[PDB]
Paper text:
ZnT/YiiP mediated Zn2+ transport is mainly powered by proton gradient. Here we determined four high-resolution structures of the plasma-specific hZnT1 and the synaptic vesicle-specific hZnT3.
Notably, a short segment of TM2 extracellular half (residues 41–46) in both protomers adopts a stretched conformation. As a result, zinc is chelated by three residues Asp47, His251 and Asp255, with His43 swinging away from the ion, which resembles the Zn2+-unbound apo state (trihedral-network). When His43 was protonated, His43 sidechain became mobile and distant from Zn2+, and TM2 segment stretched.
Numbering used by the authors:
A (entry chain B): 6 to 137, 240 to 274, 309 to 422, 429 to 447
B (entry chain A): 6 to 136, 238 to 274, 309 to 422, 429 to 447
Amino acid sequence: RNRGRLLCMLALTFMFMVLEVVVSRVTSSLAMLSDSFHMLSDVLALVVALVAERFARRTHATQKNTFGWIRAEVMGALVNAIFLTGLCFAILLEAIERFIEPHEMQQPLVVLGVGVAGLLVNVLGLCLFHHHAGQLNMRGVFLHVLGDALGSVIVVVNALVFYFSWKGPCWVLYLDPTLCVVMVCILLYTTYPLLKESALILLQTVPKQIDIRNLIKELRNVEGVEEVHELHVWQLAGSRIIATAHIKCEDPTSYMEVAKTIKDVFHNHGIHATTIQPEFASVVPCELACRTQCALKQCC
Amino acid sequence: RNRGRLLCMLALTFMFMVLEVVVSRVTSSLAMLSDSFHMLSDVLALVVALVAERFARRTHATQKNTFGWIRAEVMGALVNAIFLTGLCFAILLEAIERFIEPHEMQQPLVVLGVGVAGLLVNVLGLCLFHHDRAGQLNMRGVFLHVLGDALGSVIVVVNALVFYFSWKGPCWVLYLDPTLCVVMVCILLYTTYPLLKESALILLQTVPKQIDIRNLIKELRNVEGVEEVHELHVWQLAGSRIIATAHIKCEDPTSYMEVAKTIKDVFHNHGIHATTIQPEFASVVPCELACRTQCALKQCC
Ligand SMILES: CC(C)CCC[C@@H](C)[C@H]1CC[C@H]2[C@@H]3CC=C4C[C@@H](OC(=O)CCC(=O)O)CC[C@]4(C)[C@H]3CC[C@]12C
Ligand SMILES: CC(C)CCC[C@@H](C)[C@H]1CC[C@H]2[C@@H]3CC=C4C[C@@H](OC(=O)CCC(=O)O)CC[C@]4(C)[C@H]3CC[C@]12C
Ligand SMILES: CC(C)CCC[C@@H](C)[C@H]1CC[C@H]2[C@@H]3CC=C4C[C@@H](OC(=O)CCC(=O)O)CC[C@]4(C)[C@H]3CC[C@]12C
Ligand SMILES: CC(C)CCC[C@@H](C)[C@H]1CC[C@H]2[C@@H]3CC=C4C[C@@H](OC(=O)CCC(=O)O)CC[C@]4(C)[C@H]3CC[C@]12C
Ligand SMILES: [Zn+2]
Ligand SMILES: [Zn+2]
Ligand SMILES: [Zn+2]
Ligand SMILES: [Zn+2]
Ligand SMILES: [Zn+2]
Ligand SMILES: [Zn+2]
Ligand SMILES: [Zn+2]
Ligand SMILES: [Zn+2]
């Protein structure tokens, strides 16, 4: 389903770019012809989303990657968030430039028509991506489409203002940069949670719904286990959470009695992919340690 | 010293921005002001590396992150690579626009002076970022960004010389800048693709290139204690820190610890030291310890 939405959006973007080039060649406008090439950024964003979605379905172990490419959509969401942040910074800088030196728009009616067409295309994109793991990439595309829609609304309003008012001509020239600044603020406000979540997923951060202190406290509550060390909890993608710990039991015969208990304790929380390594005999913190232990070759 | 390196580079970037602003104000040319305000891309590129370097020295286990923030350097390298690729694509679009309609600068002399100052700053940056593995990645990203800046400065200096010595006015001189810009973006994309690939692979839990999964599992199954090995997950955290987890089946819990020493030694022969091996003592039974409500969306691989 997601691939169809992305392909339809890509087709719409290409059609709109063709329309903009054609209308520029008819109207002999070089400025909006150059503006038409600015949709290659949205084409690239859609291509990145498509690649991430295509690779996210290879959820099988591979000689190159043991987990499969389940982390592809989260990577694509991070890339799209970074690209959108860069675009927001660039258009904020451009708005500052227009503040410093004002810009006059030529042919308001053609620009208004192109803006209405772009707004309709972006509304179709929003109706494609209104969302009714994989949600990260989809919301990354949705934020870019929403930014495009806001830009289209701004340019339509700007064209209407020049056509209706421009021949107080002084304040009219400054309506575009302030609206662009407001749109940058809104876009960054909506994009920061997505970028934060993606970056915190790529880093091996504990998911926000799991507290390590409580998990450790319940882990020591099992009768067989004596102490828990080297506890690593991280999120692969979506609800795929992997937990790893070392335990001391001092009773290999009843290990399955307490291994199932530890599995149940992990299963009570949103953890189902675990790997618990027992150790049997306190000078050494961990019996199974490397012969030449180095801080540069071990986790944490 | 790495942090002081980035502080020195940031200070030089800021003072060159101030110099560009002053030159714009005295010269009363808006192009210099526009360039000075566009130069903030390097300020953000250095700030990202500084943040990553500061945050990745916290290798201790944190409440929010049990592995520490040692992956922050690789994250910063990836962010710098993506930012550089975006800047390259923007440069390519600008070159296309210049090809469609050319641009002529008003005063070659001021452009030449500003470009010479920027070229000196950038060659100092290269001499400064001349050079663990994760530390190299962030340094590699900033070095590539400074190299792209230096190539841009060389291009602008050469182009300014060409206008000052040739233009009075051939047609080809107006198109000298886009050709050099295209060459620059080609070279910079070629030299930044390996960094982006390496960073993205590291964050995608890719097996390090020096580990063969088939050989590893064949060696693991070769020891006497184990009966079979299933769900062998191997991934690289950052630099030379590789974590490998596996599930094994032993003959009996008695004398299991000898099997664990042998498996640890087998992993230690390869570049893996931070391991975790879960024995599964005794239907097909792929894994004795499995969740009751098995789901493909709630499990690794
Ligand atoms: C397009 C690319 C090249 C750049 C993307 C923007 C970055 C420059 C931004 C995005 C999110 C930012 C981070 C968001 C949150 C924080 C936590 C912040 O921690 C604090 O000190 C918070 C205050 C406190 O705890 O006292 C330090 C800056 C940092 C890492 C920020 C550093 C700058 C970042 C990486
Ligand atoms: C003169 C201005 C227009 C230039 C600088 C613009 C941006 C660099 C700033 C302006 C307001 C900032 C935002 C103000 C508030 C927040 C909320 C906060 O993130 C959250 O969403 C946390 C929860 C919350 O505050 O509701 C911190 C980031 C963010 C988006 C900030 C991101 C950076 C922004 C967009
Ligand atoms: C928004 C921008 C700035 C993001 C960064 C640029 C991306 C558009 C590029 C950077 C690396 C590229 C990837 C590099 C490697 C590959 C592998 C390639 O697959 C193969 O190697 C096929 C081999 C074969 O069988 O012939 C498919 C394209 C892809 C995913 C590329 C897709 C486009 C990517 C993500
Ligand atoms: C207006 C016209 C003249 C513009 C022409 C632009 C091209 C000459 C540029 C644009 C993007 C460049 C590509 C960007 C990224 C890469 C990846 C880089 O890494 C590899 O793929 C390794 C070599 C290989 O595996 O083939 C090789 C160069 C290449 C294909 C570049 C080749 C030259 C390209 C196609
Ligand atoms: Zn867009
Ligand atoms: Zn479970
Ligand atoms: Zn241990
Ligand atoms: Zn550890
Ligand atoms: Zn730079
Ligand atoms: Zn198992
Ligand atoms: Zn070892
Ligand atoms: Zn698995």
